[PDB]
Amino acid sequence: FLDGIDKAQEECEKYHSNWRAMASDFNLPPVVAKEIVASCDKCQLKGEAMHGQVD
Ligand SMILES: [Cd+2]
């Protein structure tokens, strides 16, 4: 667990949902990369939700 992880949160928007690219830049295992997404409130839900075009 590296503190620099806090800096990654600031650029989380820059990497968007591409956690794989962020892991390569910080060289961290999917555990921390997925967790950073798991903490962001915007990337927590995938796409929108149950609201969309459905018939
Ligand atoms: Cd985010």
Side-chain angles (χ1 to χ4, degrees), residues 25-47:
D25 290 332
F26 289 87
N27 293 140
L28 288 161
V31 172
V32 172
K34 289 180 180 175
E35 188 281 337
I36 290 167
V37 170
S39 299
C40 198
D41 288 340
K42 291 180 182 71
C43 306
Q44 183 66 225
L45 303 176
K46 184 176 183 170

